[PDB]
Amino acid sequence: ETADLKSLAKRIYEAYLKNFNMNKVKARVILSGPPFVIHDMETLCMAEKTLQNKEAEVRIFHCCQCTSVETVTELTEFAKAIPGFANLDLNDQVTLLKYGVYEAIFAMLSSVMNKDGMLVAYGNGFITREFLKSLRKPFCDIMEPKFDFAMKFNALELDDSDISLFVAAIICCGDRPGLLNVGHIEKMQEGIVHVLRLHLQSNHPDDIFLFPKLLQKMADLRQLVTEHAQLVQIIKKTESDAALHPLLQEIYRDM
């Protein structure tokens, strides 16, 4: 009710600090304050050697899967630390994760993105937005909409404490399909959402409607992920050399 709100937020923020190697503050330091730039095929090959016979498109997106698999592993550890998450039924734990991970992945991805490109290889590399756009279809259509989301998400000027509470709220959506105990999850989300609002009002006193603007972003992420999943399916089925990591196969499966 105030001490309990500090306690909920503390545990979430700390689980974020603990579990995510890359975060907004670290990313903004590196994108400022120097990362190897990938802006063409020569620089790509240079980075691959330092940071297969397959197409350039195939290699880039093979490496992405390694990054996303690490993030899904990190988000899982973060979820287990959200107060209440671990007392959930087991079917609900994996359901919340299956549906929540990519929404949370793309919200957090924004921290490493600017209008010109994004960090790769733990912030040791920077891959250009224009190089990504120069890939042949459908590979050039993968990242562009995430840059588009990210430019608008980054304009909200969130920091890591905001983001941590946001991500916990994404993970605890009571409206995931197949959920068995929606009432307990919904009680979890309400506290997170309530402390997020209060945190946003004190942290950002000049952005009146930051709370609702950020909630609109959940709907945008949900849309961004449904579209990404469709595109992953399409590439998987049309583009032979596009294997999918076995952890990702099951996430995408019943989406």
Ligand X SMILES: COc1ccc(N2C(=O)[C@@H](Cc3cccc(OCCc4nc(-c5ccccc5)oc4C)c3)[C@H]2C(=O)O)cc1
Q: Is 99 assigned to a binding site?
A: no
Q: How far apart are CA 249 and CA 170, in angstroms?
A: 21
Q: How far apart are CA 23 and CA 232, in angstroms?
A: 26
Closest distance of CB 51 from ligand X, Å: 6
Q: What is the DSSP letter of 110?
A: G
Residue linked to tokens 């929606």: 182
Q: Is 16 assigned to a binding site?
A: no
Closest distance of CB 117 from ligand X, Å: 9
DSSP string, 37-92: EE-SHHHHHHHHHH---S-HHHHHHHHHHHHHHHHHHHHHHHHTTSTTGGGS-HHH
Residue 195 parent element (H or E): helix 182-203
Closest distance of CB 215 from ligand X, Å: 23
Closest distance of CB 78 from ligand X, Å: 15
Closest alpha carbon to 67 in 18, 114, 115, 118: 118
3-state secondary structure of 120: strand
* Dihedral sign of CA atoms 199, 203, 208, 209 in order: negative
Closest distance of CB 136 from ligand X, Å: 13
- Residue (72 or 158) nearer to ligand X, CB: 72
- Residue (142 or 167) nearer to ligand X, CB: 142
- Residue (119 or 169) nearer to ligand X, CB: 119
- Residue (96 or 121) nearer to ligand X, CB: 121
- Residue (119 or 193) nearer to ligand X, CB: 119
Query: Which residues would be at the binding site for ligand X (CB under 6 A)?
Result: 47, 60-61, 63-65, 67-68, 71, 105, 109, 118, 120-121, 127, 142-143, 232, 235-236, 242, 244, 248
Number of Cβ within a 10 Å radius of residue 133: 13
Residue numbers belonging to the annotated binding site for indeglitazar: 68, 102, 252
Residue numbers belonging to the annotated binding site: 68, 102, 252
